Each structure stands twice: as C-alpha cells, then as structure tokens.
Amino acid sequence: QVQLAQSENELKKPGASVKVSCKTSGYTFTRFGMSWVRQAPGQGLEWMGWISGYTGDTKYARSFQGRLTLTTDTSTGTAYMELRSLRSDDTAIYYCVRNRVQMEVSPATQSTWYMDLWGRGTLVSVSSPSTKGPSVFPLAPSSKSTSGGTAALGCLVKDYFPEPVTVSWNSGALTSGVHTFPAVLQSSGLYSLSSVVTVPSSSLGTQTYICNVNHKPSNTKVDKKVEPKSC
C-alpha cells in the first residue's frame, strides 16, 4: 500500500515562514518527483512547484518567485516546502502530490506522469490573533409550538480560532435532520458557526438533546443542553 503522510496543521502570524513535511511510504522515494498544490477556502487548486526525488532539481510557479523553497531528504524519504513572508491570503490547505517518474524512461501516456497520489492535506492559518476557545450559547425553540408539526433547535459556536470545530448531537445518536454549517470569518478575525437539527414538536418536552462541541487547538471540550425557555 502506497501512502503520503503529511505534517500537522499550523498556525502562523503575518510575516514569518512555514515548513510542511510529507513522509513517503510504499514506493521508492527516488525514481519519483513531488508536486505541491494549495487550495484556499472556497477557491480552486493552485500549482506551487515540483521537485525531483532523484536530482533534487526544482520547478516553481511565477506567483512563488522567491517566496517558496522546495527541499528533499532522500533518507529518510521525505519532502519539505518552505513558504516565507506569509500573508492572510496564504491561508489555505496545502497538498503534497507524487507527480513524475525519475531515473527511468516513462512516457506521458502513464498515470504516473500526472498527479497520481495525493496526501490528506495540511491546513496552515495566517492571522494575527492567538488561539482561542469557542463560546457555546443556547438556541431555544421559540413561538407557540414552533410551526406546529416540526421543530428546530441548535447550538451557536461563536468566537473561536483557528478551524476546525467538531460538533455532534447526543454523542452521535441523533444524525437525521442535522445541519452543521460551514464557519464564517468575523470582522474581528475570529471564526463562528452554527449547528441545528429538526425534530418533532411532540418530542421537545419528553426527549433530551445535547450538543457536543470539540476544539482541539485550545483543547476545549464542551457539552451544552437546550430546551424551551421559561418565560
């Protein structure tokens, strides 16, 4: 089995630099090349550069004229990328991809010529504020028995940084009707998101619903409950 194990997600400030690594497995690191491509949130793919596992020769994109540097360690067989002078725009998920064959003749009619093997990806976040845990708030069902037939309740995960935040309901018991929304960037530079679920109105009084929020960067594990407010 062939695998590309990447390094953990990183949080950095404007300026400075990052060094993302990518450990190779199941194939000879030499006799192959490595490409690096990134994807900004909601945007398409952007090719950054390529490096030979055999010769060490590099090919860079015009955008990364002197900001990107690709290096390699033949033994142990791992590949690195270094991006200097970081900006808010550089916030993206960075993929490491096996791309070309080296030390042997191979035509472009082969899958190996193209970007054959992808890594899971590595998120790097460039922002000025420090790591901060989320603030969970209760979202109660309003009005007279909501619509009448179906009801909705939720949890508001507000003010946290950086992404991601995991959320589940009743520790994975309640899945149907659940809608966890993608996070939105605030003016302050912090992230916020909401998670909701549709249930029968009759179940509000009898059934109990718990949202389990997890934020690994700040190590914040919160379990909050919501039911109709006592007016």
Binding site: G44, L45, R62, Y95, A108, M115, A140, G154, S194
Partner: protein, 214 residues
C-alpha cells in the same frame, strides 16, 4: 506559461442525464491533459490521464475526448457520487497549471424553504454583543434573498450568510443569515424580522419577534 480555461464553471443536471465539461488550452498540449474529481471536504482524485485513459476503478460513463488544444469531459447516466468539482490539468510543460474548475449540482423539484427565527439568549447579552439569526431549511434552487428589518429601518454592512453543501437524500440546501450588534444598539429597537424571497414562495414570508417578550 500555459493558461487553462474551463468553460461551464457552474452546472446543474439531474440524475441519468448527460453533462459536458470543456477545457481549452492557450497552447498546443497534444493529448497530455488530466481530469480530477474533488468531492466536498475531500482531496482531489485522478479520474482520467492523457486525453482519454481512465484510471483504475473508474466506471465507464466518464468519457474523455480531445487533442492539441480542445479537450472535453462528459458524464453520462449521472449518479449521486458523480456530483463534485472537476479540474483539468496540462502536463505538457512546466509550470503545470490547473483551472477554475466546474461545480456540479443536482436540480430536483422546487422546494420552498422552512423559515425560522431565533432571538439572542440571556447568556449572550452578558458578553455585550447580541446576534440575530434567520434559518432557511431544505430548499432548491440555491439563489435565495434574505433581508433584515429593524423597526422598519434598512440594514446594510452588518450581516453574513452561510450555506451548506448538498446533502445526501433530499438534495436541497440550507442557509443561515446572521446579523450582529452590541448590547447598546440592541437596546434601541423593539421589532426584529427577516424577509425571505425564493422561487417556491409566491410572496415573501416573514418570521419576526418582539424584544422583551418570547
């Protein structure tokens, strides 16, 4: 550098339909292009290499065509797993270049949104900030207009929306608009409401709430 141009950018086709995606090159590529599939929340996957060669495990409905500078990807007999974002890539010369890509959505039947309103809780007012949210559940198509109204006072430069990706069975969308103000600003007005406009509704439906009361 070789600029790649993907034409459809956004696309809607129901299951069992045939759909065509185009990629035109700035220069002669001569067959050496590749197509990639990227499902939401996952990494890209190689679909076909060269002009037409399918990757191992790829069905057969996907058919690649082209040479020189004109290339196309067509998907026949659409299935739910085929709905993703697609990218072509030239491998003729460095620098290698991907594209803007084509997003694939599912057009089912028209479904009106379930509009709900939720006031800010008492824990939130302690922080000194208060947020109002208008929730739209399970609807199609995506283009839906949302406007906030505070005691008949126009809102602008104070709200942000978020949309979910297409879910698995009902094939509809969900949206959440969120308006945020300080405690001081929240204390000035009584009536708060969100007006929604969508193809499923004949008239804009309004869910509202008055402050001080539930």
């Amino acid at each position: 550098d070789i600029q790649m141009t993907q034409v459809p950018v956004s696309l809607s086709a129901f299951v069992g339909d045939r759909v065509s995606i185009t990629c035109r090159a700035s220069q002669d590529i001569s067959r050496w292009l590749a197509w990639y599939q990227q499902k939401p929340g996952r990494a890209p996957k190689l679909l076909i290499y060269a002009a037409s060669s399918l990757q191992g495990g790829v069905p057969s409905r996907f058919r690649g065509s082209g040479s020189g500078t004109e290339f196309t990807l067509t998907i026949s007999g659409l299935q739910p797993e085929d709905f993703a974002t697609y990218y072509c890539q030239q491998g003729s010369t460095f620098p290698y270049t991907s594209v803007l890509g084509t997003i694939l959505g599912i057009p089912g039947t028209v479904a009106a949104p379930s509009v709900f309103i939720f006031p800010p809780s008492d824990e939130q007012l302690k922080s000194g900030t208060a947020s109002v949210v208008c929730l739209l559940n399970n609807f199609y198509p995506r283009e839906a207009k949302v406007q906030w109204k505070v005691d008949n006072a126009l809102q602008s430069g104070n709200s942000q929306e978020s949309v979910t990706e297409q879910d698995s069975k009902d094939s509809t969308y969900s949206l959440s608009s969120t308006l945020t103000l300080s405690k001081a600003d929240y204390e000035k007005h009584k009536v708060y409401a969100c007006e929604v406009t969508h193809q499923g509704l004949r008239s804009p439906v309004t869910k509202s709430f008055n402050r001080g009361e539930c």
